[PDB]
C-alpha cells in the first residue's frame, strides 16, 4: 500500500496465530510488542527510548505477517504502551519512506 | 526522495538558518528537538515514550525545512538524545510509507 500519515500508521499483524494491531515505525531500530506468550526460548534484554530503559524478552527468528507480507526476525516482548514494528522487519517487507 | 530503512532515516533539517540532523519518525505523533533556545512563547509539556515521560517546552508555528521542503507547526524542545521529526510535520511535506 501507500500509507499517509494523517493518522497513526497502525496496521494488523499476525503473530503466533494471533491478530494484533501495530505501529509501523521508521524511528525504531527494533520491534517491540506488548506482553504475550510466544513459543520459544528467550533472552532477557534491555531497550531504551524517551523516558528511559525497559526490560524486555528477546525472541529470535519469529515469523510475523504484516499486511499479508511475511517477515522472520527478532521480536522483543515487554511493557510497551503500543506494539511497534521497527526497521528490522520493515526492511524485510520492502518498506520505504517516500516524498 | 525515496528513503530506505537499512539505516536510521536521518536527514538534514534547517531550523532558524541552522542545519541539524533529525530522524524521520512515523511512530512519533509530535516533533521533538534537542535543547535549544528559540525565541517565542512556550508552554510546558510532558511527553511519553518507551521508558516514561520527559519534560519539554512547546513552541507553536515553527518553520522547519526538511530536505528543501518547508513545514510549519508545533515543536517540542527538551533533553531528547535525538531530533525527531514526527507526523505533524511529515504530513506537510507529503511523506508516505510504501510497501
Ligand atoms: C521503540 C524503541 C525500541 C525505540 N528506540 C530505539 O530505536 N533506539 C533507542 C535506537 C536509537 C538510538 C539512537 C537514535 C535512534 N534510535 C524508540 O523509543 N524510538 C522513538 C524515538 C527515539 C529514539 C531514540 C531515543 C529516544 C526516542 C520513536 O521512534 C518511536 O516512534 C516511539 C514509539 C512509542 C510510541 C508511544 C509510546 C512508546 C513508544 N515514539 C515515541 O517515543 C514518541 N511518543 C509518541 O509519539 N507518543 C507517546 C504518542 C503515541 C502514542 C501511541 C502511539 C503512537 N504515538 C516521542 C518521540 C514523542
Swiss-Prot record, chains A, B:
<comment type="subunit">
    <text>Homodimer, whose active site consists of two apposed aspartic acid residues.</text>
</comment>
<feature type="region of interest" description="Dimerization of protease">
    <location>
        <begin position="49"/>
        <end position="55"/>
    </location>
</feature>
<feature type="region of interest" description="Dimerization of protease">
    <location>
        <begin position="88"/>
        <end position="99"/>
    </location>
</feature>
<feature type="active site" description="For protease activity; shared with dimeric partner">
    <location>
        <position position="25"/>
    </location>
</feature>
<feature type="region of interest" description="Dimerization of protease">
    <location>
        <begin position="1"/>
        <end position="5"/>
    </location>
</feature>
<protein>
    <recommendedName>
        <fullName>Protease</fullName>
    </recommendedName>
</protein>
<feature type="domain" description="Peptidase A2">
    <location>
        <begin position="20"/>
        <end position="89"/>
    </location>
</feature>
Amino acid at each position: 500500500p501507500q500509507i499517509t500519515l494523517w493518522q497513526r500508521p497502525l496496521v494488523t499483524i499476525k503473530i503466533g496465530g494471533q491478530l494484533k494491531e501495530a505501529l509501523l515505525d521508521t524511528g525504531a531500530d527494533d520491534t517491540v510488542l506488548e506482553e504475550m506468550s510466544l513459543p520459544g526460548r528467550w533472552k532477557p534484554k534491555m531497550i531504551g527510548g524517551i523516558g528511559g530503559f525497559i526490560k524486555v524478552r528477546q525472541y529470535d527468528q519469529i515469523l510475523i505477517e504484516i499486511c499479508g507480507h511475511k517477515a522472520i526476525g527478532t521480536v522483543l516482548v515487554g511493557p510497551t504502551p503500543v506494539n511497534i514494528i521497527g526497521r528490522n522487519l520493515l526492511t524485510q517487507i520492502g518498506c520505504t519512506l517516500n516524498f
